Amino acid sequence: GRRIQGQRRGRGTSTFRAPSHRYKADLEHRKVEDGDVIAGTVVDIEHDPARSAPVAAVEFEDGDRRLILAPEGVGVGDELQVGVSAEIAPGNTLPLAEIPEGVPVCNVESSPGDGGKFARASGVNAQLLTHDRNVAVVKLPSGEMKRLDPQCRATIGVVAGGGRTDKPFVKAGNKHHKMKARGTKWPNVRGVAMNAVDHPFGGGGRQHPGKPKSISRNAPPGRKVGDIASKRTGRGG
Amino acid sequence: ARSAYSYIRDAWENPGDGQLAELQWQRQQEWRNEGAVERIERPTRLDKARSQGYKAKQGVIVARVSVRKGSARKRRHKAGRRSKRQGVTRITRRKDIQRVAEERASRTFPNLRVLNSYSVGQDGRQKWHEVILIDPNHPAIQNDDDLSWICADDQADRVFRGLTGAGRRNRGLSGKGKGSEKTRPSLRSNGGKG
Amino acid sequence: MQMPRRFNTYCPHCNEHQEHEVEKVRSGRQTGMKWIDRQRERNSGIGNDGKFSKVPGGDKPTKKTDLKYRCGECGKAHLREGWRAGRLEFQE
Amino acid sequence: TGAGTPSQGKKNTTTHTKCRRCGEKSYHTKKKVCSSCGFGKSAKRRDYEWQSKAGE
RNA sequence: AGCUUUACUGCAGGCUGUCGCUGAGGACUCUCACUCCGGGAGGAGGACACCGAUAGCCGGGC
RNA sequence: GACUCGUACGGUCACUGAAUCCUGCCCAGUGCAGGUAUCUGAACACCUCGUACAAGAGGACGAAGGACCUGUCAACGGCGG
RNA sequence: GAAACAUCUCAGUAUCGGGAGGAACAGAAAACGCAACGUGAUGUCGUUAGUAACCGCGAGUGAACGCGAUACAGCCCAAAC
Ligand SMILES: [Cl-]
Ligand SMILES: [Cl-]
Ligand SMILES: [Cl-]
Ligand SMILES: [Cl-]
Ligand SMILES: [K+]
Ligand SMILES: [Mg+2]
Ligand SMILES: [Mg+2]
Ligand SMILES: [Mg+2]
Ligand SMILES: [Mg+2]
Ligand SMILES: [Mg+2]
Ligand SMILES: [Mg+2]
Ligand SMILES: [Mg+2]
Ligand SMILES: [Mg+2]
Ligand SMILES: [Mg+2]
Ligand SMILES: [Mg+2]
Ligand SMILES: [Mg+2]
Ligand SMILES: [Mg+2]
Ligand SMILES: [Mg+2]
Ligand SMILES: [Mg+2]
Ligand SMILES: [Mg+2]
Ligand SMILES: [Mg+2]
Ligand SMILES: [Mg+2]
Ligand SMILES: [Mg+2]
Ligand SMILES: [Mg+2]
Ligand SMILES: [Mg+2]
Ligand code: NA
Ligand code: NA
Ligand code: NA
Ligand code: NA
Ligand code: NA
Ligand code: NA
Ligand code: NA
Ligand code: NA
Ligand code: NA
Ligand code: NA
């Protein structure tokens, strides 16, 4: 047969790449020798093409201009702070240690100083729960309990743009426009609609998968399709 | 009496014990951060170098080369192949790493010529060899009765034609009798069967 | 069929009739050092191994008689042609 | 649209041109590589053994 | 010839044990290689992982 | 190296195919996944035999996997005499 | 090709990568082993011989020592001091 679509993906051709050259900023937390002296003022609220959520343009005392992962509430004029001593209000960023338990946080770091990794999608937010001299348990938006180094920096508040998922796309055109600004090939042709040569589900005089859909984790690329290492399927039971 | 050299040599008979061990555990840290080919002012194994033709004089150069450990880095077949030729994993190359090292070095010094080379250890994923090269054009060598031979036109790119010592051993030319029927005078003259 | 564990018959060694004892030939064990054992290791490589890639064939409906005839006098055994027999049991 | 005659009409693009090195009209002005002598790709001149019968 | 599969035989790939890198005091501590985060100070991890070698299993992805 | 100037309101892999009323029963087989007293399960090292060595024979230990058990059908499919 | 075909064969061929010279390569024994009280660097030619050896012991594959010739040529380091 021929390589399946998932295999064409990896090659990184234009079709599968994201329009990076059209992206505004690689949102990442600022650095500070220490102290926390850093602070700036929101100048504008822009649209971020890579996340379909707003990003805030901020100006710091050291005249540094950078875009930030805008939580909800932040407006132009507002002043934000970054450091071990920053205030405990929405928009400010400080290590999990200096953050009071029970406070919604976003754009959490996985490794202190990595600039943020977790919870940075529209409306989501993490939840700092347990403190310690070593571990800072945080509940990520997926429900998992992530144990983290208390030195990992994070932003207070929930990410802006919440509720985006509530309104349906309604029409293909709308999807089309969104998909065009992402690293994704769209629309999607069903495997079962292809020829055997093209996909393990292809072929037949009627459309149905050849074998069962749940595939072993050990399956090789070219054959891993359908329900990957499913612990279960269906809704029942 | 023993020579000073004899001690360097005796220490390298067991690069895993004694001071040499502690020494390697150290150097390699720096080596793993160096390039593919690093010219070095002095041979790490003086006895070996001199023994192999080295000589503290103008026109004599030395460089340490690192090559990855393991079998061939081969691509699987993209057309019809009988089961015999469908291999990838177990296939190994017919030139030993030391010979690969000599070549990468010689290519780094286009004007020089490989005189010899020797192993200086290996970590878990690579091997290091120090190659002794010679400037066939420097008069300091054109006048050396022990090395001027390398200046002859027919010694040009000698490493790429397997005229090196490691080259000739890898070509199965060590034995002069039994077992060397398909090797001498040359692999190619013997229909490539060695 | 039934068969006497012992009985008189010609002993090719003594050149005279003696009382022999019948026993079923127990398979000897392999050394794994015969020439064929070496060639298997030698010749087996990447991909199909030719003959060494085959697997044992089936069986015949009935096997022949695989017996050793031991001479009670000189204690030496001898072999004979066998004969198809679904089952063979010795009497005593 | 026919892949034949009707698709011939759009062919007004220039690719292969006289080669500064070998003089053959094989210099792909978009690739900046000569399909004939390999100029632009190789310092050595393009030549393969299959350009003639194996025993010649 | 293309295609399929619980056809024959193999080949990638995945999982797994073992050896090398690899070090100090059947479960455990450690730091020094090695890995990663950090501009750096330095933080996390740590003889594991990665990588090289081998063995068993799965293996029409080829 | 793509995904990714991305981080679960994400994006990957599949099935179905707007709305509306709905979507029953079956986990035996096959698939996937979880577990597992016990059984099975390669090589290195280890023990025994063997060989002044070696080939080789046997043992002990036993990973994933399998047996066995469980979950799962908007998983492949099934819904008769 | 093996009257299929997988080892084998085609064949280390076709083709690809790198490089020298007017020739290249080889070369002064940790050789040979007509076992000797023998030969004496290396290529090459004739022979040894379709012999020994390999091989679903199938089809096929296939040397060497020696011998007769051609031409002959033997040296330099490392170390000891
Ligand atoms: Cl979407
Ligand atoms: Cl050279
Ligand atoms: Cl019997
Ligand atoms: Cl002789
Ligand atoms: K063939
Ligand atoms: Mg696109
Ligand atoms: Mg980023
Ligand atoms: Mg949706
Ligand atoms: Mg579709
Ligand atoms: Mg169709
Ligand atoms: Mg297929
Ligand atoms: Mg349908
Ligand atoms: Mg269907
Ligand atoms: Mg020749
Ligand atoms: Mg095999
Ligand atoms: Mg056409
Ligand atoms: Mg056919
Ligand atoms: Mg990095
Ligand atoms: Mg097939
Ligand atoms: Mg449709
Ligand atoms: Mg045939
Ligand atoms: Mg036949
Ligand atoms: Mg042959
Ligand atoms: Mg001989
Ligand atoms: Mg002298
Ligand atoms: Na189908
Ligand atoms: Na050179
Ligand atoms: Na050979
Ligand atoms: Na062999
Ligand atoms: Na076809
Ligand atoms: Na079932
Ligand atoms: Na089941
Ligand atoms: Na035929
Ligand atoms: Na055929
Ligand atoms: Na064969």
- Rounded Cα distance, C30 and C19, in Å: 32
Q: How many domains does chain B have?
A: 1
Chain C adjacent subunits, 3+ CB pairs under 8 A: B
Provide the edge-to-edge strand list for the sheet that holds B113-123: B37-39, B60-68, B126-134, B113-123
Positive/negative CA dihedral, C59, C60, C61, C64? negative
How distant is C1' of F16 from CA of A26, in Å? 37
Residues in contact with A98: Cβ distance below 8 Å, sequence separation at least 6, in sequence order? A84, A85, A86, A88
Task: Identify the H or E element spanning B118.
Answer: strand B113-123
Provide the 3-class DSSP secondary structure of residue B19.
Answer: helix
How distant is C1' of F71 from CA of A182, in Å? 38
Amino acid at B144: D
Beta bridge partner(s), residue C3: C90
Q: Is A36 in contact with A84 (CB distance < 8 Å)?
A: yes
Q: How many domains does chain C have?
A: 1
Amino acid at B55: K
- Rounded Cα distance, D37 and D22, in Å: 6
Q: Report which bound ligand comes closest to the CA of A209.
A: 26
Ligand 16 centroid–CA A1 distance in Å is 22
Instruction: Note whether C48 contacts B84, CB cutoff 8 Å.
Output: yes
Residues in contact with C82: Cβ distance below 8 Å, sequence separation at least 6, in sequence order? C64, C65, C66, C67
Amino acid at C34: K
Within 7 Å of a protein beta carbon, the nucleotides of strand G are 6-9, 12-16, 18-22, 24-33, 41-44, 54-58, 63-65, 76-81
Q: Which residues of C touch B90 (CB under 8 A)?
A: 46
Place of tokens 């939840």: A127
Q: Annotated binding residue at D43?
A: no
Q: What are B37-45's contacts with CB under 8 Å, separation 24+?
A: B37/B63, B37/B64, B37/B65, B37/B104, B37/B105, B37/B108, B38/B63, B38/B64, B38/B65, B39/B63, B40/B64, B40/B130, B43/B130, B43/B132, B44/B120, B44/B130, B45/B8, B45/B9, B45/B12, B45/B118, B45/B120, B45/B130
CATH H superfamily, domain A160-237:
Ribosomal protein L2, domain 3 (4.10.950.10)
Place of tokens 């802006």: A160
**Pairing between β-strand B37-39 and β-strand A227-228 as defined by DSSP bridges:** unpaired
Helix, strand, coil tally for chain D in percent (to 5): 10, 10, 75
The domain ranges of chain A are 1-78, 82-159, 160-237
- Rounded Cα distance, B99 and B168, in Å: 10
Q: How was this structure determined?
A: X-ray
> What b/e readout covers A115-135, taking b as 16+ CB neighbours within 10 angstroms?
bbebbbbbbbbbbbeebeeee
How distant is C1' of F66 from CA of A130, in Å? 44
- Rounded Cα distance, A56 and A80, in Å: 11
Question: What resolution (Å)?
Answer: 2.8
Nearest CA distance, C53 vs chain B (angstrom): 12
Is D1-56 CATH 3.40.718.10? no
CATH number, domain A1-78: 2.40.50.140
Amino acid at A46: E
Which of B137, B102, B96 minimizes the C-alpha distance to B116?
A: B102
Q: How far is CA B189 from CA B155, B182, B183, D56, in A?
A: 20, 9, 8, 20
Q: Which residues of B touch C53 (CB under 8 A)?
A: none
Q: What is the 3-state secondary structure (H, E, C) of chain A?
A: CCCCHHHHHHCCCHHHCCCHHHCCCCCCCCCCCCCCCCEEEEEEEEEECCCCEEEEEEEECCCCEEEECCECCCCCCCEEEECCCCCCCCCCEEEHHHCCCCCEEECECCCCCCCCCECCCCCCCEEECCCCCCCCCEECCCCCEECCCCCCEEEECCECCCCHHHCCCCCHHHHHHHHCCCCCCCCCCCHHHCCHHHCCCCCCCCCCCCCCCEECCCCCCCCCCCEECCCCCCCCC
The domain ranges of chain D are 1-56
Q: Which residues of C touch B82 (CB under 8 A)?
A: 47-48
Nearest CA distance, B3 vs chain C (angstrom): 47
Angle between helix B18-31 and helix B4-11 axes, rounded to 10 deg: 70
DSSP class per residue in B93-106: -SS-HHHHHHHHHH
- Rounded Cα distance, C12 and C79, in Å: 10
**CATH code: domain of residue C64:** 3.10.450.80
Q: Which residues of B touch C48 (CB under 8 A)?
A: 82-84
**Nucleic strand G contact set for D 1-30 (CB, < 7 Å):** none
Chain C residues at the B interface, defined by Cβ less than 8 Å, are 45-48
Instruction: Note whether C48 contacts B86, CB cutoff 8 Å.
Output: no
Domain that holds residue B127: 1-194
CATH number assigned to the domain with residue range A82-159, chosen from the 4 options 3.90.1170.50, 2.30.30.30, 3.40.50.740, 3.40.50.720:
2.30.30.30
Q: Annotated binding residue at C14?
A: yes
Domain that holds residue C52: 1-92
